[PDB]
Write an enzyme that holds these catalytic residues in place. Structure first.
Site, PDB file in Angstrom:
ATOM      1  N   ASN A  11      55.304  36.236  40.164  1.00 58.96           N
ATOM      2  CA  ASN A  11      55.299  37.353  41.096  1.00 58.96           C
ATOM      3  C   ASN A  11      56.665  37.530  41.760  1.00 58.96           C
ATOM      4  O   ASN A  11      57.437  36.623  41.904  1.00 58.96           O
ATOM      5  CB  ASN A  11      54.252  37.086  42.166  1.00 58.96           C
ATOM      6  CG  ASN A  11      52.904  36.904  41.583  1.00 58.96           C
ATOM      7  OD1 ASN A  11      52.437  37.748  40.847  1.00 58.96           O
ATOM      8  ND2 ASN A  11      52.246  35.829  41.877  1.00 58.96           N
TER       9      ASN A  11
ATOM     10  N   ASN B 151      47.229  30.652  42.576  1.00 56.69           N
ATOM     11  CA  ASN B 151      48.550  30.983  43.109  1.00 56.69           C
ATOM     12  C   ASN B 151      49.210  29.807  43.815  1.00 56.69           C
ATOM     13  O   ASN B 151      48.594  29.003  44.501  1.00 56.69           O
ATOM     14  CB  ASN B 151      48.379  32.162  44.039  1.00 56.69           C
ATOM     15  CG  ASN B 151      49.690  32.697  44.576  1.00 56.69           C
ATOM     16  OD1 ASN B 151      50.084  32.380  45.704  1.00 56.69           O
ATOM     17  ND2 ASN B 151      50.369  33.499  43.797  1.00 56.69           N
TER      18      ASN B 151
ATOM     19  N   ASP C 270      37.403  25.974  51.049  1.00 55.17           N
ATOM     20  CA  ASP C 270      38.267  26.405  52.139  1.00 55.17           C
ATOM     21  C   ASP C 270      37.916  27.784  52.646  1.00 55.17           C
ATOM     22  O   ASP C 270      38.670  28.381  53.447  1.00 55.17           O
ATOM     23  CB  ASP C 270      39.728  26.223  51.784  1.00 55.17           C
ATOM     24  CG  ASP C 270      40.280  24.862  52.029  1.00 55.17           C
ATOM     25  OD1 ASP C 270      39.612  24.008  52.572  1.00 55.17           O
ATOM     26  OD2 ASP C 270      41.517  24.700  51.674  1.00 55.17           O
TER      27      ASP C 270
ATOM     28  N   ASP D 232      57.176  37.831  45.040  1.00 51.04           N
ATOM     29  CA  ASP D 232      57.181  37.160  46.299  1.00 51.04           C
ATOM     30  C   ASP D 232      57.607  35.706  46.217  1.00 51.04           C
ATOM     31  O   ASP D 232      57.553  34.971  47.185  1.00 51.04           O
ATOM     32  CB  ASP D 232      55.849  37.375  46.952  1.00 51.04           C
ATOM     33  CG  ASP D 232      54.702  36.668  46.292  1.00 51.04           C
ATOM     34  OD1 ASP D 232      54.896  36.044  45.252  1.00 51.04           O
ATOM     35  OD2 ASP D 232      53.593  36.721  46.877  1.00 51.04           O
TER      36      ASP D 232
ATOM     37  N   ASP E  80      51.130  32.695  39.568  1.00 49.96           N
ATOM     38  CA  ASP E  80      49.725  32.445  39.285  1.00 49.96           C
ATOM     39  C   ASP E  80      49.627  31.679  37.990  1.00 49.96           C
ATOM     40  O   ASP E  80      50.212  32.069  36.981  1.00 49.96           O
ATOM     41  CB  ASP E  80      48.995  33.775  39.125  1.00 49.96           C
ATOM     42  CG  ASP E  80      49.199  34.710  40.263  1.00 49.96           C
ATOM     43  OD1 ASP E  80      49.259  34.318  41.403  1.00 49.96           O
ATOM     44  OD2 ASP E  80      49.371  35.929  40.026  1.00 49.96           O
TER      45      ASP E  80
ATOM     46  N   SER F 266      55.995  33.534  44.405  1.00 56.12           N
ATOM     47  CA  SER F 266      54.847  32.758  43.951  1.00 56.12           C
ATOM     48  C   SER F 266      54.541  33.066  42.509  1.00 56.12           C
ATOM     49  O   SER F 266      54.998  34.058  41.943  1.00 56.12           O
ATOM     50  CB  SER F 266      53.648  33.064  44.852  1.00 56.12           C
ATOM     51  OG  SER F 266      53.052  34.290  44.505  1.00 56.12           O
TER      52      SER F 266
ATOM     53  N   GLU G 196      41.176  37.243  34.534  1.00 57.17           N
ATOM     54  CA  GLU G 196      42.406  36.679  35.056  1.00 57.17           C
ATOM     55  C   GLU G 196      43.370  36.321  33.935  1.00 57.17           C
ATOM     56  O   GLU G 196      44.565  36.586  34.075  1.00 57.17           O
ATOM     57  CB  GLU G 196      42.100  35.412  35.869  1.00 57.17           C
ATOM     58  CG  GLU G 196      41.507  35.674  37.238  1.00 57.17           C
ATOM     59  CD  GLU G 196      42.381  36.422  38.202  1.00 57.17           C
ATOM     60  OE1 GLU G 196      43.605  36.532  37.857  1.00 57.17           O
ATOM     61  OE2 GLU G 196      41.911  36.848  39.259  1.00 57.17           O
TER      62      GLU G 196
END
Length: 129
Positions: free
Chosen positions: A46, A59, A101, A48, A52, A50, A35
């Site tokens: 990104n 994210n 989650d 979109d 990271d 968002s 990563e």
């Protein structure tokens, strides 16, 4: 900070990742390697809207708040800045939340695309833990 594999392994173990929810320690080290190349400040912005953040490239849509991301859930209840700390507390706690989650480690694209199915224990071999 840019960790070494064994230093990171030890820190992650102190923070309770070894075998956490069925993921042996090397999985987490491998994920960090691919990563972020172990860089606590890694940041991938990104298209979109968002981003990271940090050593585990968590994210900003679901997990941390950066105030610029549509659809924000902030499920880790942290500012994304916390994921850029040299100490790995927030990143480890948020990683734990991601799996708590119901997401596997499949949530980390680099783990899925690079670590899954391999001899991940190699990442912790020779390390003091």
């Amino acid at each position: 900070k840019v960790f070494g594999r064994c230093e990171l392994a030890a820190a992650m173990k102190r923070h309770g990742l070894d075998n956490y929810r069925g993921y042996s320690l090397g999985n987490w080290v491998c994920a960090a390697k691919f990563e972020s190349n172990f860089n606590t400040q890694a940041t991938n912005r990104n298209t979109d809207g968002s981003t990271d953040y940090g050593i585990l490239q968590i994210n900003s849509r679901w997990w941390c708040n950066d105030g610029r991301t549509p659809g924000s859930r902030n499920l880790c209840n942290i500012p994304c800045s916390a994921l850029l700390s040299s100490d790995i507390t927030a990143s480890v706690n948020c990683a734990k939340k991601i799996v708590s989650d119901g997401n596997g480690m499949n949530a980390w694209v680099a783990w899925r695309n690079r670590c899954k199915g391999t001899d991940v224990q190699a990442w912790i071999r020779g390390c003091r833990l």
